[PDB]
Structure 1
Amino acid sequence: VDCALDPLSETKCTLKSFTVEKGIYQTSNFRVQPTESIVRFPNITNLC
Structure 2
Amino acid sequence: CTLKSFTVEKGIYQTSNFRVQPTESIVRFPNITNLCPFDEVFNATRFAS
Shorter chain as denominator, the TM-score bin is: 0.5 to 0.7
Q: Which has the larger radius of gyration?
A: 2
Please list every run of 5 or more consecutive structure 1 residues that lacks an aligned counterpart in the other structure.
1-12
Using CA pairs under 8 Å that are at least 6 residues apart, name the structure with larger relative contact order, 1 or 2: 2
Q: What's the C-alpha RMSD, in Å, of the aligned pairs?
A: 1.3
Superposition TM-score, scaled by structure 1 size: 0.58
Give 1 or 2: higher helix fraction.
1
The percentage of counterpart residues that share the same residue type is: 100
| TM-score, with structure 2 as normaliser | 0.57
Number of aligned residue pairs: give it.
36
| Structure 2 unaligned regions, length at least 5 | 37-49
